[PDB]
Design a protein around this nucleic acid. Structure first.
Ligand SMILES: [Mg+2]
Ligand SMILES: [Mg+2]
Ligand SMILES: [Mg+2]
Ligand SMILES: [Mg+2]
Ligand SMILES: [Mg+2]
Ligand SMILES: [Mg+2]
Ligand SMILES: [Mg+2]
Ligand SMILES: [Mg+2]
Ligand SMILES: [Mg+2]
Ligand SMILES: [Mg+2]
Ligand SMILES: [Mg+2]
Ligand SMILES: [Mg+2]
Ligand SMILES: [Mg+2]
Ligand SMILES: [Mg+2]
Ligand SMILES: [Mg+2]
Ligand SMILES: [Mg+2]
Ligand SMILES: [Mg+2]
Ligand SMILES: [Mg+2]
Ligand SMILES: [Mg+2]
Ligand SMILES: [Mg+2]
Ligand SMILES: [Mg+2]
Ligand SMILES: [Mg+2]
Ligand SMILES: [Mg+2]
Ligand SMILES: [Mg+2]
Ligand SMILES: [Mg+2]
Ligand SMILES: [Mg+2]
Ligand SMILES: [Mg+2]
Ligand SMILES: [Mg+2]
Ligand SMILES: [Mg+2]
Ligand SMILES: [Mg+2]
Ligand SMILES: [Mg+2]
Ligand SMILES: [Mg+2]
Ligand SMILES: [Mg+2]
Ligand SMILES: [Mg+2]
Ligand SMILES: [Mg+2]
Ligand SMILES: [Mg+2]
Ligand SMILES: [Mg+2]
Ligand SMILES: [Mg+2]
Ligand SMILES: [Mg+2]
Ligand SMILES: [Mg+2]
Ligand SMILES: [Mg+2]
Ligand SMILES: [Mg+2]
Ligand SMILES: [Mg+2]
Ligand SMILES: [Mg+2]
Ligand SMILES: [Mg+2]
Ligand SMILES: [Mg+2]
Ligand SMILES: [Mg+2]
Ligand SMILES: [Mg+2]
Ligand SMILES: [Mg+2]
Ligand SMILES: [Mg+2]
Ligand SMILES: [Mg+2]
Ligand SMILES: [Mg+2]
Ligand SMILES: [Mg+2]
Ligand SMILES: [Mg+2]
Ligand SMILES: [Mg+2]
Ligand SMILES: [Mg+2]
Ligand SMILES: [Mg+2]
Ligand SMILES: [Mg+2]
Ligand SMILES: [Mg+2]
Ligand SMILES: [Mg+2]
Ligand SMILES: [Mg+2]
Ligand SMILES: [Mg+2]
Ligand SMILES: [Mg+2]
Ligand SMILES: [Mg+2]
Ligand SMILES: [Mg+2]
Ligand SMILES: [Mg+2]
Ligand SMILES: [Mg+2]
Ligand SMILES: [Mg+2]
Ligand SMILES: [Mg+2]
Ligand SMILES: [Mg+2]
Ligand SMILES: [Mg+2]
Ligand SMILES: [Mg+2]
Ligand SMILES: [Mg+2]
Ligand SMILES: [Mg+2]
Ligand SMILES: [Mg+2]
Ligand SMILES: [Mg+2]
Ligand SMILES: [Mg+2]
Ligand SMILES: [Mg+2]
Ligand SMILES: [Mg+2]
Ligand SMILES: [Mg+2]
Ligand SMILES: [Mg+2]
Ligand SMILES: [Mg+2]
Ligand SMILES: [Mg+2]
Ligand SMILES: [Mg+2]
Ligand SMILES: [Mg+2]
Ligand SMILES: [Mg+2]
Ligand SMILES: [Mg+2]
Ligand SMILES: [Mg+2]
Ligand SMILES: [Mg+2]
Ligand SMILES: [Mg+2]
Ligand SMILES: [Mg+2]
Ligand SMILES: [Mg+2]
Ligand SMILES: [Mg+2]
Ligand SMILES: [Mg+2]
Ligand SMILES: [Mg+2]
Ligand SMILES: [Mg+2]
Ligand SMILES: [Mg+2]
Ligand SMILES: [Mg+2]
Ligand SMILES: [Mg+2]
Ligand SMILES: [Mg+2]
Ligand SMILES: [Mg+2]
Ligand SMILES: [Mg+2]
Ligand SMILES: [Mg+2]
Ligand SMILES: [Mg+2]
Ligand SMILES: [Mg+2]
Ligand SMILES: [Mg+2]
Ligand SMILES: [Mg+2]
Ligand SMILES: [Mg+2]
Ligand SMILES: [Mg+2]
Ligand SMILES: [Mg+2]
Ligand SMILES: [Mg+2]
Ligand SMILES: [Mg+2]
Ligand SMILES: [Mg+2]
Ligand SMILES: [Mg+2]
Ligand SMILES: [Mg+2]
Ligand SMILES: [Mg+2]
Ligand SMILES: [Mg+2]
Ligand SMILES: [Mg+2]
Ligand SMILES: [Mg+2]
Ligand SMILES: [Mg+2]
Ligand SMILES: [Mg+2]
Ligand SMILES: [Mg+2]
Ligand SMILES: [Mg+2]
Ligand SMILES: [Mg+2]
Ligand SMILES: [Mg+2]
Ligand SMILES: [Mg+2]
Ligand SMILES: [Mg+2]
Ligand SMILES: [Mg+2]
Ligand SMILES: [Mg+2]
Ligand SMILES: [Mg+2]
Ligand SMILES: [Mg+2]
Ligand SMILES: [Mg+2]
Ligand SMILES: [Mg+2]
Ligand SMILES: [Mg+2]
Ligand SMILES: [Mg+2]
Ligand SMILES: [Mg+2]
Ligand SMILES: [Mg+2]
Ligand SMILES: [Mg+2]
Ligand SMILES: [Mg+2]
Ligand SMILES: [Mg+2]
Ligand SMILES: [Mg+2]
Ligand SMILES: [Mg+2]
Ligand SMILES: [Mg+2]
Ligand SMILES: [Mg+2]
Ligand SMILES: [Mg+2]
Ligand SMILES: [Mg+2]
Ligand SMILES: [Mg+2]
Lengths: 146, 97
RNA sequence: CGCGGGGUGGAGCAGCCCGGUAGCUCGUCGGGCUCAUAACCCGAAGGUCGUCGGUUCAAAUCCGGCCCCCGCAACCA
RNA sequence: GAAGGGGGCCUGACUGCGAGGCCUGCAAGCCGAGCAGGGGCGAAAGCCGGGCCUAGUGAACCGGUGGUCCCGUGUGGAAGG
RNA sequence: AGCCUGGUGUUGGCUCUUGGUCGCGCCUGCGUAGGAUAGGUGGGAGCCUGUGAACCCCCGCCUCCGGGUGGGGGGGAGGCGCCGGUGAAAUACCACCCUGGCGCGGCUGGGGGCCUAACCCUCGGAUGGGGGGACAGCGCUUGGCGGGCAGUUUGACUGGG
RNA sequence: CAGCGUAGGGUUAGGCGGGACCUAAGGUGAAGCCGAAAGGCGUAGCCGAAGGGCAGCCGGUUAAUAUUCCGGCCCUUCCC
RNA sequence: GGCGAGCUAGCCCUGGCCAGGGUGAAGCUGGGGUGAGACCCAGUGGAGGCCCGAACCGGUGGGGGAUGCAAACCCCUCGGAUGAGCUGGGGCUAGGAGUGAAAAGCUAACCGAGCCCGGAGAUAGCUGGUUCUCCCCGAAAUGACUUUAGGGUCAGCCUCAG
RNA sequence: CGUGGUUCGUGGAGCCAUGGGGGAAUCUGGGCGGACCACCGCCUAAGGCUAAGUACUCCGGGUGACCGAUAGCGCACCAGU
RNA sequence: GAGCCGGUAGCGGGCGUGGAUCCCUGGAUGUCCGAAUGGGGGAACCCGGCCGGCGGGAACGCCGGUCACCGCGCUUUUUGCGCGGGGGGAACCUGGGGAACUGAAACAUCUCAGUACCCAGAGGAGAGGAAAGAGAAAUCGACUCCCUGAGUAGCGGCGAGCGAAAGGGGACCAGCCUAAACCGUCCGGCUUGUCCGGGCGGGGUCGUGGGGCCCUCGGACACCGAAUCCCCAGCCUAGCCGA
């Protein structure tokens, strides 16, 4: 008989794989141990509903990046720093690149997880990357003076 | 009380027929009956312990309608009573109308 | 009548498989050891291998018809 | 004056019937001329429907087997009769 | 009736181990005899190898141990047959199959061990713990033993029976 | 004449016996188990006595009752 | 299908009963005995499906009774009588069932399967019985077959009508 | 598979019912017309209710080629005594 | 409409035309037991809880009221409340069970017989009933009941025996509600959703197949109409006139 798994097993499938097994097994082990439930017409319906819910609120999360990827991956922000010469007195941190972009084009980012690794000194044209999952490379120019 | 709590199958009365001789459809002169006597046929009654709400409930059912117990267990809706949830799980939830 | 086996020499009986020794024991005879017979040793007797017809180079083999003994299993107005 | 013994061909140890009788409580049992079909032996007349005769036997029911037309449960079949 | 018993339901997990059938794959087989240790019959002037041959060395299995046979490789251009024949047959090869064997999968069957969680027992204590355990019990069904019980039968003639 | 017919009368208890106490075999039986129906089981509980428990002895009196009425002496429980 | 253990059988609970006499086990004490013992002797003691014998429980032999006093009695005689004893009260077990120190005994005065009502007007090839009158005729007791033989079917013999 | 019902006693045994095992489909679905198959037809299972025509006579009444006290009810009467 | 206080006279008293006895309808009272129901119990007896009353009344006793169990429904398992059940009835009815004698001139299948009887349940009746029907006619149309079909068809140790249906003639006459798709709603579960589930409402009920949903037509005053409620006639439960 077919049941809906509520957990990975090895010996069957995982978290939603409708697989059939001995009714004895179902009644006296799985069901009692919350290990799963019966492939009811109801439970089966509620499962499709389960699958669509995710597939939506998930393919929407990717539709949040692919969107914020475009407005960001091409537009550039400027970081004017007391640069002295090819060696900033201070230093632009990820925390800074955040504040900056918030006005220089007016968006908000992490500012954590930005592939920042160690505050950036010196000047030049940098290309970093962002998140979450399939992501975007942000470009920015650290300049000079005020 | 050897009756299924779900289907209502209860023991019936049936004859045990002692026949001998070779079938007619096998070139025999035909079958002969050396006795007919009454006997009961009981439904294949079994226990089904199933946990419902907070309580353990035990159905005496024909093996045939065991599935029905678990279907009756799916229907859940507010009931913190005594070991007498079956009173509610029973015909209340069977066919009702 | 139904199903399965086969009769091989005087007896049971291996060869019935992947078609090819037509064997072993007791009995009797010949011969020696034994004071002796038996034991025991040497050799030897007897098979168209149930019936006939077939498939192969043959065949006890395989098929098929056939025949009873035994074997099995029901039925009996 | 064969029903006995011997030989030659043959299979009437036929099919379809059967006048009339014997016997007889019933049911049975028995004898039987003659007609027809197709035969056997005989030159023929003819004889032949087992055996010199009188015992060697078993109603019905239930089934088996081979035929054959016959019936075939809406119909064609089939099952089964 | 009772008792024994196969199948099946209640009845689950994990394994090891086997059988039948089927498909496919690879081997399997011996009579001097032909030059041989060629299973039945066909097709068959062809081949096989430079998509690395024979000659050898580890290797496994089969064996009438004679040899059969692939794998690893040194190996580097040969290696078979018909032909001729003291043999029913011809023995490169492509085949369809027979007998039996292993191998892989398929549909099924048998056994053994372990597990626990149904089912059973038990624990002043339980949503639990311990023991037994998919056995036993119980349902349906099979066949059997079955004066423990039940219903009956157990002839007539006859100088009484 | 009667144990017979008709009629009238006669049986007096806080302490005697039993009950507003206890439990026994057994019976019944919330829980629970089983059985075609009837019903059968069954823990507690309840019922159940010639057992356990519990306070009255001596006289007088009536045609007929008396540890019951009376007399004397003596006790029980309940309520305040 | 019900009614019965108020008789009887067994068992369960709670009570009660057994005059009087006899025999004198163990143990105990003391004495003897021995290396120490076994053991022996006294006295004490008071055991027992022990003895005699009433109540009580029986029912051995004989007589009587026999339309009885009595549907199990009476007389004489006899058995047990501290035990597997007797007995009151309260309970439980039953009809193919109970109970039985076992006779097929007992389960309400007849038990090889209780009683009551019912199926029921069981069945009875057997037995008995079968009722006013007159008139005419008038048999059979054989054969065949029959789990048939004292019962039947056909025939035979009687009668009536055409 | 095991049985019951029907006239159907296993029969060629359908149909309706169902104790056991297995176990669908939703009009192009399903059941039936007596094994089975085809064809042609009939009907829509697994939910329920439904007057009247029918059965009976404790009870009241009306009738009798019904009884008339051994009859008629067991009881004509203080009898289920 | 003149007599009455039963059978039942009597003793000893009373009542009636101001309408008695008597008859019909309704009401009141109705000890105790009994389904018996506060609890016991060897029916007609015994013993209690709670509220109230009576006696001098705390102890005691009496009076009124109330208190069994089970089911269903509400409702907060609270705890209550409401509703109902229980038992009886001559026969009749349905269901669950279910013999034997006997017959077969023995006997087992068969018969007796689904009888007797036991049990449950129902009601003035009960059952049954609106085709997954019949069964050969392009047929009939719920069910019950009678006549017939018919001792037919068949069944059967093919023995004993058992024994239909269609069809025809009559009696009576009737047909409906739902489940599901779909829609609305309240609620509960949660692994929060065009999610699942339960509860109510709408919707829908059919065999020339029906229904849902979408579109178009035109969808209505109507028209049919209860088995339910209401009214009435009529009828029953006393009587009266009557040559
Ligand atoms: Mg059987
Ligand atoms: Mg045949
Ligand atoms: Mg019988
Ligand atoms: Mg099943
Ligand atoms: Mg001659
Ligand atoms: Mg001649
Ligand atoms: Mg003649
Ligand atoms: Mg003759
Ligand atoms: Mg002769
Ligand atoms: Mg016969
Ligand atoms: Mg025949
Ligand atoms: Mg025949
Ligand atoms: Mg024809
Ligand atoms: Mg027909
Ligand atoms: Mg036909
Ligand atoms: Mg035939
Ligand atoms: Mg024929
Ligand atoms: Mg088994
Ligand atoms: Mg099993
Ligand atoms: Mg295998
Ligand atoms: Mg191939
Ligand atoms: Mg365990
Ligand atoms: Mg455990
Ligand atoms: Mg364990
Ligand atoms: Mg088992
Ligand atoms: Mg058996
Ligand atoms: Mg047997
Ligand atoms: Mg006997
Ligand atoms: Mg026997
Ligand atoms: Mg008999
Ligand atoms: Mg005799
Ligand atoms: Mg004589
Ligand atoms: Mg004599
Ligand atoms: Mg007097
Ligand atoms: Mg006093
Ligand atoms: Mg006294
Ligand atoms: Mg007292
Ligand atoms: Mg008091
Ligand atoms: Mg008490
Ligand atoms: Mg009881
Ligand atoms: Mg009870
Ligand atoms: Mg009950
Ligand atoms: Mg008391
Ligand atoms: Mg007392
Ligand atoms: Mg006392
Ligand atoms: Mg006292
Ligand atoms: Mg005193
Ligand atoms: Mg006196
Ligand atoms: Mg005195
Ligand atoms: Mg005094
Ligand atoms: Mg009885
Ligand atoms: Mg007694
Ligand atoms: Mg005394
Ligand atoms: Mg003494
Ligand atoms: Mg001493
Ligand atoms: Mg001394
Ligand atoms: Mg003394
Ligand atoms: Mg002494
Ligand atoms: Mg004595
Ligand atoms: Mg003595
Ligand atoms: Mg003496
Ligand atoms: Mg004595
Ligand atoms: Mg004496
Ligand atoms: Mg005497
Ligand atoms: Mg005597
Ligand atoms: Mg005597
Ligand atoms: Mg005498
Ligand atoms: Mg005498
Ligand atoms: Mg005398
Ligand atoms: Mg004496
Ligand atoms: Mg004693
Ligand atoms: Mg006693
Ligand atoms: Mg009896
Ligand atoms: Mg007995
Ligand atoms: Mg005795
Ligand atoms: Mg007696
Ligand atoms: Mg009778
Ligand atoms: Mg008789
Ligand atoms: Mg005359
Ligand atoms: Mg004369
Ligand atoms: Mg006779
Ligand atoms: Mg005659
Ligand atoms: Mg004349
Ligand atoms: Mg069947
Ligand atoms: Mg039948
Ligand atoms: Mg038969
Ligand atoms: Mg037949
Ligand atoms: Mg049938
Ligand atoms: Mg049948
Ligand atoms: Mg059919
Ligand atoms: Mg069926
Ligand atoms: Mg079924
Ligand atoms: Mg169709
Ligand atoms: Mg039909
Ligand atoms: Mg047909
Ligand atoms: Mg079949
Ligand atoms: Mg139809
Ligand atoms: Mg319907
Ligand atoms: Mg009705
Ligand atoms: Mg009347
Ligand atoms: Mg008169
Ligand atoms: Mg009289
Ligand atoms: Mg009389
Ligand atoms: Mg008179
Ligand atoms: Mg009467
Ligand atoms: Mg009388
Ligand atoms: Mg009277
Ligand atoms: Mg009076
Ligand atoms: Mg007067
Ligand atoms: Mg006056
Ligand atoms: Mg007036
Ligand atoms: Mg009144
Ligand atoms: Mg009143
Ligand atoms: Mg009471
Ligand atoms: Mg008060
Ligand atoms: Mg009161
Ligand atoms: Mg009622
Ligand atoms: Mg009733
Ligand atoms: Mg009752
Ligand atoms: Mg019935
Ligand atoms: Mg009945
Ligand atoms: Mg019932
Ligand atoms: Mg029945
Ligand atoms: Mg009988
Ligand atoms: Mg008869
Ligand atoms: Mg008879
Ligand atoms: Mg007879
Ligand atoms: Mg007899
Ligand atoms: Mg019958
Ligand atoms: Mg009744
Ligand atoms: Mg009526
Ligand atoms: Mg009605
Ligand atoms: Mg109905
Ligand atoms: Mg309908
Ligand atoms: Mg229709
Ligand atoms: Mg026939
Ligand atoms: Mg019948
Ligand atoms: Mg008709
Ligand atoms: Mg008609
Ligand atoms: Mg109509
Ligand atoms: Mg919803
Ligand atoms: Mg709805
Ligand atoms: Mg609705
Ligand atoms: Mg509606
Ligand atoms: Mg449509
Ligand atoms: Mg007048
Ligand atoms: Mg007048």
């Amino acid at each position: 008989m077919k049941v809906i798994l509520l957990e990975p097993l090895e010996n069957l499938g995982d978290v939603g794989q409708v697989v059939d097994v001995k009714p004895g097994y179902a009644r006296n082990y799985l069901l009692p141990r919350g290990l799963a439930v019966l492939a009811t017409e109801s439970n089966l319906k509620a499962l499709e509903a389960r699958i669509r819910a995710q597939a939506k609120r998930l393919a929407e999360r990717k539709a949040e990046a692919e969107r914020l990827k475009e407005i960001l991956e091409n537009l550039t922000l400027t970081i004017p720093v007391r640069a002295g010469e090819t060696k900033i007195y201070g230093s632009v941190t990820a925390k800074d690149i955040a504040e900056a972009l918030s006005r220089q084009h007016g968006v908000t980012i992490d500012p954590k997880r930005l592939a920042l690794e160690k505050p950036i000194k010196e000047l030049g044209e940098y290309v970093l990357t962002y998140k979450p999952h399939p992501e975007v490379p942000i470009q920015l120019k650290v300049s000079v003076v005020a | 009380s050897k009756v299924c709590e779900i289907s209502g199958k209860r023991p019936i009365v049936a004859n045990s027929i002692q026949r001998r001789g070779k079938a007619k459809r096998e070139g025999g002169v035909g079958k002969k009956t050396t006795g007919i006597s009454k006997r009961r046929q009981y439904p294949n009654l079994q226990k089904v312990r199933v946990r419902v709400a907070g309580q353990e409930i035990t159905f005496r059912v024909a093996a045939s309608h065991i599935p029905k117990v678990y279907e009756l267990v799916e229907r859940a809706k507010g009931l913190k009573l005594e070991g007498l949830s079956p009173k509610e799980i029973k015909k209340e939830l069977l066919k009702l109308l």
